[PDB]
Amino acid sequence: MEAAHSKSTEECLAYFGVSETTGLTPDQVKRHLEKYGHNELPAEEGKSLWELVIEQFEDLLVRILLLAACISFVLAWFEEGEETITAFVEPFVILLILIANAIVGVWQERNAENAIEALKEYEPEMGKVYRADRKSVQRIKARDIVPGDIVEVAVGDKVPADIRILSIKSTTLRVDQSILTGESVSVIKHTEPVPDPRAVNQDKKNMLFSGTNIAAGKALGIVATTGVSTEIGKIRDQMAATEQDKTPLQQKLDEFGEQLSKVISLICVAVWLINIGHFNDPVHGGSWIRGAIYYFKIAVALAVAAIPEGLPAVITTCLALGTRRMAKKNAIVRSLPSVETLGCTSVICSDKTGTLTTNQMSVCKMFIIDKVDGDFCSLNEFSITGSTYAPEGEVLKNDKPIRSGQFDGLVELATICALCNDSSLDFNETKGVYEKVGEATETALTTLVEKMNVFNTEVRNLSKVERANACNSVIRQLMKKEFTLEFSRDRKSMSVYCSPAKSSRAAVGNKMFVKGAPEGVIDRCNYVRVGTTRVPMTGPVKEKILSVIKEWGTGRDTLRCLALATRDTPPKREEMVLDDSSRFMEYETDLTFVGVVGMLDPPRKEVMGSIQLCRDAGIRVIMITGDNKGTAIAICRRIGIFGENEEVADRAYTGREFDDLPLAEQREACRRACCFARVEPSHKSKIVEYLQSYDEITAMTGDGVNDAPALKKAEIGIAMGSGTAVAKTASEMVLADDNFSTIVAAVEEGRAIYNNMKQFIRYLISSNVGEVVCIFLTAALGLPEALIPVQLLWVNLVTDGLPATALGFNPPDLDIMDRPPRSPKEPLISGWLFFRYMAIGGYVGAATVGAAAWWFMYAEDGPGVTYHQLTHFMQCTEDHPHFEGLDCEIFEAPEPMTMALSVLVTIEMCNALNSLSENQSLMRMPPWVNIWLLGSICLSMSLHFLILYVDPLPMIFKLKALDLTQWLMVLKISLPVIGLDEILKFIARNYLEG
């Protein structure tokens, strides 16, 4: 690793003193071991999440509760033993709950690391290295690279470590970058320097890393690095040995968690500390040590209520049962905790040629020179009938279907596209896929001549395999190809040499068909192919070629234009010396320029629909591409990635521009930025960091054996279907098909997931404040019962799980997409929503001042008594030395404790209107929306009978009162005060309707 890309290739030879000639000798091998290492690469290291992020804060309350329970038992058993009855069995039931906490805990960890799960392995086959340590072409194996291996990347060499190109033993070189970038495109690197000091991998466009050499390019490259030192290794393991990030909904878990824990830990301790007086007094005190431990357990019950353990297991359950009915798009669901987390997606940064450009590269347009007189040209311009790898659908004459063989120029044109085409299309029926065999450029040509069907062959009548190459090889069966000299960067053309078969016309009547990059062809093309005829290169003809390159090339319509020229006067294998670049170049004149074909990386497709919602309504799609700025501009406008014919400069920033400007302006590319041109993993990470500092939290695409800080540190790894194992093993949302719906159903179904987590987390935070305030009543005042430790846990058992899933979840709420644009800046805890939370908190607070404390009077439906005066003075009742302690303890009696428990259960359950819809209250009551609440009510009902009547529970808790109206003090607050939240939804800009 060195500036290398920037520097002379000739210097790069000297950098290790190596060549095909003077090869890597044994002490050069040694010399390099003695510097760089030898591809020591860490594996997987799927680190966990749950306990660390949640339990290990409140552990010192919730888990040590077990120890405190044991100590209270140990005390009592030495003092009044069995006699402690309720609070004797209470430590055992606390133990039972702690066992259940541990079970729920281990389930949650074995999902949290199971999100990460079995990340990374499988390097594909390395390369043929020339060496001198054995001067033999060693098909090297991953570890035994010793920087300076002279790798012939060529036939199926998955380029091993950090390489820089030295020399090519062919005129083409195409190195696929799927396995390096995500972007599944066989890029043109180049032998010579890329002068700019940019350290990133696209800007290193002569440095090679894990790229697929697609055989078209018998190259030779120097291994510039090996080991952790290697860019590939470094960029793997700095993410994928310890992966995690904000995984979008988790960032909104922060909002609650980060504050809550610290507050809860503190207030639990405060409840204990204030009690210094009130631990001494009678039914808990006397032996005030009991009192202290009692209040500790009460304060820990407060912690349980405020940080519910069930909650994340519940999301995992909602997730499981949700996702299997959501996801009508590409979503190979790699792991459960990827999805109900993914559903607050804010940016989908997809690599270009997968989905956003369907990796189905066919020719979309062409023009031939039709006929020319008085220099004015009939250019027989055309679009091609129908996108995709469909060899059906011929050619449109402006733009209506025509069998292409009806036009004279299209004969020799088709002969170019079939012959000057050494790659292919196959229809591997076995896999059901039209495989783009070899270079996508020539696959496009294959599909083109199949569509064209110049020789009117039956085609769809041979097997659909043969139908990918039939018309093609009919042409080849006439004009027998008899060598090819492939596309060089320099001459900007390739020469296929072909004459008839059967008719012995080789050498003599042997034509040459040339294909290459625009200008380099259009100037050597000294003749215009006037369809059949030939004239010189005439003016207005060349003028309209020179419009087309900018027309269908810088307009919204932009083709990847490829110029095609026939040679008429039959060249000679006898004059064709078959070696140098320029030799070929000068043979390539007498060129009757036929026209330009254009492969616009699929037309329609479809990729535009999503992008509206992915510009405004929420989830911004970015194109990641190896395309340069100018091309990417138009290439994006073509598919609505920048929507209309609006201005640019900004909308497609290059990874170069991005990196030229220091980190502030680099950041100030990222917000709502529509495309990032010339980008790879090294840029993808930076894009995420900047997106996160706008809250445009990510889902980033890649596949490659160094896409790791774009798989994670990127919220969700979107695996390209394409190259490497590590996509499909380590990225959570695997793509398979090219459908654009994948994007749309984030702004649809992903926002449903967001609403799931909303109503779910809402319920607990609004209801279970009742449990929270119960602790305040029982602990601060003289036992005016609400919820003794075990009694608390029953309300928990009612309110966690079942109501959260009941609202959640399923069709969550009304207005699924139709809900306001989820503009990445909305909190979870929206101001007026927090006001609602506090209002419901006020309600459950007042209802717990009810509990038994108020409720022993007014309309009790049981204890026809009162002394609700006394409650005010703290030191109420509690066994004899207390204010008015003639009685033992009126709240300790059967009906009040059990009923206080029961009233909290019911009053918290009333929140299942306020948290049911977010705000569309009345209209989200009809049972075709999520009404699992029926099951929640069934829980409360069955548990009511159980807790009251079935005596084993009355031992631990207290005994039955009667199923009745009950609590007409407190219950008759609930429904009116819920109606007050209706009024609160109408406060300000006061409409009064709902």
Short mmCIF file of N, CA and C in Angstrom, two decimals, residues 249 251-252 445 451 513 712 724 745 962:
data_model
loop_
_atom_site.label_atom_id
_atom_site.label_comp_id
_atom_site.label_asym_id
_atom_site.label_seq_id
_atom_site.Cartn_x
_atom_site.Cartn_y
_atom_site.Cartn_z
N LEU A 249 -34.74 2.10 14.08
CA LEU A 249 -35.61 2.24 15.25
C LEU A 249 -34.86 2.25 16.57
N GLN A 251 -32.20 3.91 17.28
CA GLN A 251 -31.92 5.31 17.60
C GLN A 251 -33.07 5.97 18.37
N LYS A 252 -34.31 5.55 18.13
CA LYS A 252 -35.43 6.07 18.91
C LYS A 252 -35.61 5.32 20.22
N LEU A 445 -25.55 -6.48 -26.94
CA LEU A 445 -25.52 -6.77 -28.36
C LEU A 445 -26.16 -8.10 -28.72
N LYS A 451 -33.41 -9.84 -30.74
CA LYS A 451 -34.62 -9.05 -30.89
C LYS A 451 -34.86 -8.75 -32.36
N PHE A 513 -15.45 -6.13 -38.78
CA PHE A 513 -16.53 -5.35 -38.22
C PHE A 513 -15.97 -4.77 -36.94
N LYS A 712 -22.67 -2.99 8.01
CA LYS A 712 -23.03 -2.32 9.25
C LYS A 712 -22.24 -1.03 9.38
N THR A 724 -20.23 -11.70 -3.64
CA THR A 724 -19.69 -12.39 -2.49
C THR A 724 -20.67 -13.11 -1.56
N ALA A 745 -42.32 -0.06 -0.71
CA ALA A 745 -42.61 -0.70 0.55
C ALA A 745 -41.46 -0.61 1.57
N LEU A 962 -65.37 -9.12 45.56
CA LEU A 962 -66.30 -9.82 44.69
C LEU A 962 -66.31 -9.13 43.34
#
